Amino acid sequence: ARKFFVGGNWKMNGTIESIKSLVETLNNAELDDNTEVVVAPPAIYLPLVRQSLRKDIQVAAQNCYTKASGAFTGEISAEMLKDLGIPWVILGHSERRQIFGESDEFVAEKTKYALDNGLKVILCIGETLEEREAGKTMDVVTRQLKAIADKISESDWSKVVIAYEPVWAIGTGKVATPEQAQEVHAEIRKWLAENVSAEVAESTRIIYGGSVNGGNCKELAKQPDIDGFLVGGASLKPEFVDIINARQ
Amino acid sequence: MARKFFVGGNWKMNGTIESIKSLVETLNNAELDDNTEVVVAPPAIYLPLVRQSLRKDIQVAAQNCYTKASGAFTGEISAEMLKDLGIPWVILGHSERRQIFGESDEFVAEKTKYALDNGLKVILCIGETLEEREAGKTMDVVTRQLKAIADKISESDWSKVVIAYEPVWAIGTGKVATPEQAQEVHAEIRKWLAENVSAEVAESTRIIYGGSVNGGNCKELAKQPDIDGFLVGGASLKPEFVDIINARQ
């Protein structure tokens, strides 16, 4: 059985005070023992969160670069994350692919480098509304996955969670239907079976992201190839706990 | 003139907890010229540690920030987070962000205006590539990059700006500009400021040089009249950073 996985990406939000309050809310929450929970604060708040958050929730960075060190003003290395005791990193998120132009190869290089230096990776993929309307959903997400698959080894995949996030569902309030999400997750898993291995396909979590909230997460969690969620803005609000508990 | 000598240390993507403690300890124990304004810029994940432990006469800079107060910008740091952490400075427009991460002049200008409006001071980086200099475009490039900021900010905003001229061909290459080459561009930048902002902004804005500066060449550069200090890359991780802070004594 694939362990249910809920990631909370806080994006560019938070102060010391509101993050202390948010961590307090998590430290007091009754969480489904069967969910693996990860939260991703802003880089500058990674020490505050790692020091004070309950140890059964792990911490992620929101981005990292491709080299161990160097003349890369404004970038964080996977080595700094490991030095600070941050075990996860979100990579390839739609906001970085679009606003900051990160290419499929760039995201692949980050993934390979993060995995080789001890990090676990939430790998984000997903098609735009235009690509869907053109009938290109599968072509796009498999192209995005293939860039990673061509660089990492079969055993690397054990440290990867795949987040499928339709760009048209991110922050828009237009959630994929359970049938739409399931169709793409099933096709991602089939692709993994035919290009990496059956074992990778069977064991890799494929989580869904894009306007997941308290009211729709339970039905989404019932789908057989949906292994959890990547949550954006709801991750800052108390309904993050309901989403963690979507299998109850 | 009355322009206070300014030395900025950009650590870029370098450091661990232990190597940063040692770097800060070395700075904390140094004898530093009282007339030098010193700023150091750690990776964002180390901003708390450095701000907590560094002697308070050295201020701290972030190496970048975004254009908005908050929102759905995975991987970005805002000006508000910086003020919340007590980080008073930010470096914007560094060549590496222009060339590797595609930051436009306007994008840099947006960040510059937003930082200044939310209580930050800005080290603003400008500079021409080797190929632009070979087409005789040095002045055109650096004034174009400056004008994008000037079109957005007010005359009083400039009191919180330090301009760092870094010829891209001098960054990390070991090919430092000669004192004459640096002085020529700094004079042109200051002339541009007098013609397009005001005489007073021209007279008071620090224009600092960056590019392969080290303990062995900083004193001669600091003698040039329109060079008001340094933005130091690789040498800011080493003890000779102290010697650069002390380049005028």
DSSP letter string, A170-202? TTTS-PPPHHHHHHHHHHHHHHHHHHT-HHHHH
CB neighbour class for A111 (10 Å; exposed up to 12, middle 13-18, buried from 19): buried
Dist. CA B76–CA B210, nearest whole Å: 26
Dist. CA B150–CA A50, nearest whole Å: 41
Pairing of strands A88-91, A57-61: parallel
Residue from the list B66, B77, B96 with its beta carbon closest to the beta carbon of A73: B96
Dist. CA A207–CA A39, nearest whole Å: 14
Cross-chain Cβ contact B96/A72 below 8 Å: yes
Buried b (16+ CB within 10 A) or exposed e, B196-231: ebeeebbebbbbbbbbbbbbebbeebbebebbbbbb
CB neighbour class for A136 (10 Å; exposed up to 12, middle 13-18, buried from 19): middle
Pairing of strands A120-125, B121-126: unpaired
Pairing of strands A57-61, B121-126: unpaired
Residue from the list B63, B70, B72 with its beta carbon closest to the beta carbon of A95: B72
Cross-chain Cβ contact B94/A73 below 8 Å: yes
Resolution in units of Å = 2.2
Dist. CA B104–CA B123, nearest whole Å: 16
Instruction: Enumerate the H helices of B118-205 as residue ranges.
Output: 130-134, 138-150, 179-196, 199-204
Task: Count other C-beta atoms under 10 Å from residue A215's C-beta.
Answer: 10
Residue from the list B17, B74, B78 with its beta carbon closest to the beta carbon of A96: B74
φ/ψ (deg, to 5) at A108 = -60, -45
Residue entry with tokens 């500009």: B177
A63 touches chain B (CB under 8 A): yes
Query: What's the token pair of residue B244?
Result: 């650069």
Smallest CA-to-CA distance from B44 within B68, B20, B26 is with B20
Look up the CATH number of domain B6-245: 3.20.20.70
Instruction: Enumerate the H helices of B12-129 as residue ranges.
Output: 17-28, 47-53, 79-84, 95-99, 105-117
Task: Count other C-beta atoms under 10 Å from residue A191's C-beta.
Answer: 17
Smallest CA-to-CA distance from A61 within A100, A82, A96, A88 is with A88
Q: How many CB pairs under 8 A join A and B?
A: 122
Contact (Cβ atoms closer than 8 angstroms) between residue B116 and residue B160: yes
Radius of gyration of chain B (CA): 17
Contact (Cβ atoms closer than 8 angstroms) between residue A37 and residue A29: no
Buried b (16+ CB within 10 A) or exposed e, B122-140: bbbbbbbbeebbeeeebbe
Dist. CA B60–CA B41, nearest whole Å: 6
Contact (Cβ atoms closer than 8 angstroms) between residue A73 and residue B91: yes
Query: What's the token pair of residue B178?
Result: 């000669």
Helix (H, G, I), strand (E, B) or coil at B127: coil
Task: Count other C-beta atoms under 10 Å from residue B35's C-beta.
Answer: 11
In Å, how far are A77, A86, B78, B146 from A119, measured between CA atoms? 11, 8, 25, 40
- Distance in angstroms between the alpha carbons of the first and the last residue of chain A: 16
Contact (Cβ atoms closer than 8 angstroms) between residue B58 and residue B69: no
Q: What is the 8-class DSSP label of residue B238?
A: S
Q: What is the 8-class DSSP label of residue A219?
A: H
Dist. CA B93–CA B152, nearest whole Å: 15
Dist. CA A227–CA A234, nearest whole Å: 18
Helix (H, G, I), strand (E, B) or coil at B53: helix
Dist. CA B24–CA A70, nearest whole Å: 19
- Distance in angstroms between the alpha carbons of the first and the last residue of chain B: 16
Please identify among residues 159-218 of chain B the ones whose CB lies closer than 8 Å to any CB of chain A. Answer: 171-172
Residue from the list A16, A69, A73 with its beta carbon closest to the beta carbon of B10: A73
Kindly give, in sequence order, each residue whose CB lies less than 8 Å from that of residue A190, ignoring residues fewer than 6 positions away: A201
For residue A95, the chain B residues in CB contact (below 8 A) are: 72-75
Dist. CA B7–CA B230, nearest whole Å: 5
Dist. CA A225–CA A169, nearest whole Å: 19
Dist. CA B213–CA B221, nearest whole Å: 9
Cross-chain Cβ contact A73/B63 below 8 Å: yes
φ/ψ (deg, to 5) at A178 = -50, -35
Contact (Cβ atoms closer than 8 angstroms) between residue B2 and residue B240: no
Helix (H, G, I), strand (E, B) or coil at A126: coil
Pairing of strands A88-91, B58-62: unpaired
Q: What is the 8-class DSSP label of residue A61?
A: E
φ/ψ (deg, to 5) at B8 = -110, 135
CB neighbour class for A113 (10 Å; exposed up to 12, middle 13-18, buried from 19): buried
A77 touches chain B (CB under 8 A): yes
CATH of A4-244, one of 3.90.550.10, 1.10.3720.10, 3.20.20.70, 3.40.50.300: 3.20.20.70
Mutate to test the interface with B, among A10, A12, A113 (most CBs of B within 10 A): A12
Q: What is the 8-class DSSP label of residue A2?
A: P
Dist. CA A233–CA A22, nearest whole Å: 13
Q: State which residue of chain B sits closest to A10, comparing Cα positions.
A: B74
Please identify among residues 125-154 of chain B the ones whose CB lies closer than 8 Å to any CB of chain A. Answer: none
Residue entry with tokens 């701290």: B60
CB neighbour class for A213 (10 Å; exposed up to 12, middle 13-18, buried from 19): middle
B104 touches chain A (CB under 8 A): no
Please indicate the experimental technique that yielded this structure.
X-ray
Dist. CA B225–CA B186, nearest whole Å: 9
Half-sphere exposure of residue A149: CA atoms within 13 angstroms, side-chain side: 20
Contact (Cβ atoms closer than 8 angstroms) between residue B146 and residue B163: yes
Smallest CA-to-CA distance from B8 within B159, B122, B137, B139 is with B122
Q: What is the 8-class DSSP label of residue B65?
A: -
Shortest distance between the Cα of B194 and any Cα of chain A, in A, equals 30
Dist. CA B27–CA B13, nearest whole Å: 19
Pairing of strands A35-40, B207-210: unpaired
Residue entry with tokens 């990406």: A9
At how many degrees (to 10) do helices B179-196 and B138-150 cross?
40
Task: Count other C-beta atoms under 10 Å from residue B151's C-beta.
Answer: 12
B70 touches chain A (CB under 8 A): yes
Query: What's the token pair of residue A151?
Result: 């660089």
Dist. CA B119–CA B79, nearest whole Å: 8
B115 touches chain A (CB under 8 A): no
* Sign of the four-CA dihedral A170, A166, B99, A42: positive
For residue A42, the chain B residues in CB contact (below 8 A) are: 76-77, 81
Smallest CA-to-CA distance from A201 within A126, A132, A140, A149 is with A149
φ/ψ (deg, to 5) at B116 = -60, -35
Query: What's the token pair of residue A41?
Result: 């604060």
Dist. CA A128–CA A140, nearest whole Å: 9
Contact (Cβ atoms closer than 8 angstroms) between residue A65 and residue A77: yes
Contact (Cβ atoms closer than 8 angstroms) between residue B130 and residue B181: no
Contact (Cβ atoms closer than 8 angstroms) between residue B141 and residue B188: no
Dist. CA A126–CA A119, nearest whole Å: 22
Query: What's the token pair of residue A82?
Result: 């490991």
Contact (Cβ atoms closer than 8 angstroms) between residue B162 and residue B93: no
Contact (Cβ atoms closer than 8 angstroms) between residue A115 and residue A82: no
Dist. CA B124–CA B149, nearest whole Å: 9
Dist. CA B46–CA A59, nearest whole Å: 16
